Design a protein around this ligand. Structure first.
Ligand SMILES: [Mn+2]
Ligand SMILES: [Mn+2]
Ligand SMILES: [Mn+2]
Ligand SMILES: [Mn+2]
Lengths: 321, 321, 321, 321
């Protein structure tokens, strides 16, 4: 059942920082992420595109890499100092996980990093060093009507949520909201290191799979404009669920699908979770409002489709059904 | 087939002005319309409540009347001058419709009025005189987060839309948008006297029935707040459809159900239709975007449920299936 | 004092439609109106640019023409039918005003038109025919964060407001709001033909001069984004007054200056004025809130700077001080 | 010159948490803070009112206490754990500052606390324990149009900013933005413990004085509604500055004055400052955009008026001019 708790301290994680996504047609994906969504290109080449949101100063929040199979190559977290990359390496080695360290980084603009196949089969990366680039916070001359301003969280699908939760708590994540039954069993959990509702969340299901990566906008009208632009471009069929308001997290949300089917959440409205005794909100598994505060109808694909993730050799991790 | 065109001129209609609805439990309805939606009470007694929106100066936009069967007693249009009330009476008399004129009005605050059972079975009222009340436009001290600022239109369900359309064009309504097939047959039409997309619209289906009455908010966030409040009050199951953006009319919309099941549309975003040659926008019956610009899933009840309307004796008009 | 009331009927005016502005450097002005403000180019040549707002279907709302002196060449109103152009010509001829008729129009995309040097010295144009162009209402792929969606009104500066008001009332404009003193003398007036607060307004001052031309946005955040973009482009010194809320008209506003100093108002939030007995709101000349609902400080240039207007020969009208 | 750096560690501060202000007429203040601004009353008695913002779970963000002289009695910061209250006491004791520890708290709902007259003359409180109350985040049934959702920061006026800055950096606050001259001298600094731009800021001027306490709204339209409501209530002369956008901090802001003249900032739009190497943004003292991104005119009172602060005996600290 439970992942053992190492005797070495967990690495001090600051926040989720970026995700590396493999796409099958780079030009088609570039059209979606840059021309439709408006993400900012930090740099690109024939095979990879480095994108960042408006208020980011690190090198990128998303890396799109062309590959033969659409999948997620890495969920990356920034750690507090260089020594924490060492700590992350030691922690996972004690758990017996495969680890790979590259002083020069795995993606451009990132420095010394360690990638690991974690206990739940996910490719996690921990890094501290990264090139700083121009922070576009006040470049209102580049601000689009649907501007994505920051990367907020990842959502992972795994078969055993209680095992996943205890493992992430040992890593230092705290639970801001969870869904449990009368028995006290955790069905899903929102976990954070930074002061928003979450950096990652665990959803029960066949896995390991990536459910979605999420960006925030400043206000609700920005999310509506994304829908409107998609309708004008005749790609409204890529709008999967939303807009709506989730009861869990209180987020005003929208889920859309990229060309390979990877799910992107765009939401707005966070609340502060930084206090040491921030109250956990537990939702009952039968409370309808947990999914949708407004009662919007259920979208089946949202519970069944999710992206494959890769092992450190670049091959898909088998999905446990 | 087509209603005959009278030889007397049509009354000069300015805009839709109010609707009289019969509710089965006035206190339960008062809670929804006043405590939940925030409409302003002009006056009320044991059996009837007169409500108005924020920017209205005439006596009321809605009259709620207690009765044994939930239904709509009257669709009321304001005409241009006192003489037009005579015109409306003469016009319908020539069509052979039952008319009833009351110099003192049918509802409080309204003067000389004529009500008719129109050719499609709907109770229409035409009046000019009305008591003026405090226009609350700048009473920001009363402004709620989901404030309804003005009454915009009615939507009617009738079995033969081409007959209804030609009948309303003779009355002087112009078509801003319609849905037609390749054969050029009209399936639905949006018709207006004032300079917005419509004062009334015709939907094909079993009728005569009232599909909805609609109010506008100033901005999109006001509609979102109505949803959030209903979720907090635990009546999100009364949210029927939306929020969404209609392709036809371009409205950002929300449809909710009152305690008796009468459908209220709250929407925002109009466009100007006042020019004499305002282009009619014709949508193809197979274009999915005409219903939802964002492709939101269809909601069955929206196409089957609608409210009964009353004849001039106060009895429901039989529904033609 | 008063302009005589002609014995021939006034032309039936539908709304203000466009303004022809002379600029001294076309490329500099194009940068402002198109690159900064985002207006849509209908067509252009070496000497003139035809622009329209998002929801317009007539050929243009603004014509920028290069010339030696920055000034306003024409305030154009669309009339109800072709016969009304004849009516406009006859009406002004009876007043003894100079008139010039061109069956082929004075600006591209406009047909039979009559221009007149009106009694207050303004170059007014009346036309019906105009080429229709693609209405961009639902082109959300072109929608900018600060999108100007429609042309709403003109504001004119004239030395004798009571004379100007009585003359515009004879033309059929109604007063929605005015500013008067205890004596009952009109200091300024908002006048309309269409169903918003105004198509034109009269401000007392040295004239004839054009105070501003105004465009509406859908919501308040669109106006804030214009400010933000101007700050990022380092041209915030062209923001003259606002954002604020006017007590008169209830508009959330912003006034900015183009390269030649012509004033452009961008506002949002109208209210309906279409009923025949729409109550006039009279503000007292000493009520502070009439200028600014929020008490924002007075901006002196707003009361002294305004654009010159041209006579029908293209020469500036002398300003009466 | 510089405050000495103690040899004991600084207490681990999480965020600014509440301010205790003394008002001269509690009922008049209650009307402003509760009836006008809509803050939520946690509890109150004849002499004191405890208020909290929408998303707060600790007992209060503001304590209003009736007293003979309007002033600020305490700037309170929540620390990470009970042991940190001991740390704060030891730390200030080593600086030679007067401290007062109360196991039972100084205000209701707060536990073990230490208050100090800090080196710059300000009454700072550090506490960990506080009673939790219903977090109203999703009580949309209570949500007003101008809802204040969370307390964000304090702003302090002090004559020697470089001394104050170094003192706060030793306490562990990091600088997100500062204003410096060519000589590299600090004129003002924005300092934070939590992940927003600041928990407190230092403004040069006669002090010690409290410049403002700030609350955030979810969106810009909420701030606009506060202005509109104040204009409707005829207290727009209490709006001191804004709405505007600050270049420093990037906040869309509004400053208003309570009945005793204490300055409240309502703002929205934060950006994330949590990374260990978050880039400090340094603004030049001559850059006009640092104050107002839109170039709004300067408001003199903003630079001269500020609130007195009290010593631990409840007497005003003399202001150094
Ligand atoms: Mn999510
Ligand atoms: Mn409708
Ligand atoms: Mn104006
Ligand atoms: Mn501040």
């Amino acid at each position: 059942n439970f992942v053992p708790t190492p005797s070495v301290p967990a690495p001090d994680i600051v926040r989720c920082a970026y995700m590396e996504i493999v796409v099958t047609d780079l030009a088609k994906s570039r059209e979606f992420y840059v021309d439709v969504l408006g993400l900012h290109v930090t740099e690109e080449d024939e095979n990879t595109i480095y994108l960042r949101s408006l208020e980011e100063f690190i090198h990128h929040n998303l890396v799109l890499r062309q590959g033969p199979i659409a999948a997620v190559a890495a969920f990356a977290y920034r750690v507090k100092s260089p020594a924490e990359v060492d700590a992350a390496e030691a922690y996972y080695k004690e758990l017996g996980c495969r680890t790979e360290r590259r002083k020069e980084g795995f993606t451009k603009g990132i420095g010394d990093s360690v990638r690991v196949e974690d206990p739940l089969g996910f490719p996690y990366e921990f890094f501290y060093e990264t090139e700083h680039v121009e922070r576009l916070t006040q470049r209102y001359d580049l601000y689009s009507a649907g501007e994505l301003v920051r990367l907020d969280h990842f959502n992972q699908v795994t078969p055993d949520v209680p095992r996943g939760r205890a493992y992430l708590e040992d890593l230092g994540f705290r639970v801001s909201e969870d869904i449990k039954d009368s028995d006290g069993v955790t069905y899903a959990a929102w976990m954070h290191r930074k002061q928003t509702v979450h950096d990652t969340a665990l959803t029960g299901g066949n896995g390991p799979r990536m459910h979605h990566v999420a960006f925030a906008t400043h206000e609700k009208h920005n999310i509506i404009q994304i829908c409107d632009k998609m309708g004008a471009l005749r790609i409204s069929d890529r709008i999967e669920r939303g807009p709506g308001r989730h009861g869990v997290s209180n987020a005003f949300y929208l889920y859309i699908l990229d060309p390979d089917g990877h799910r992107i959440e765009i939401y707005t409205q966070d609340y502060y979770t930084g206090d040491p005794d921030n109250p956990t909100i537990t939702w009952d598994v039968h409370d309808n409002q947990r999914r949708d505060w407004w009662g919007n109808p259920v979208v089946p694909s949202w519970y069944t489709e999710a992206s494959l993730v890769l092992d450190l050799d670049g091959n898909p991790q088998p999905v446990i059904v």
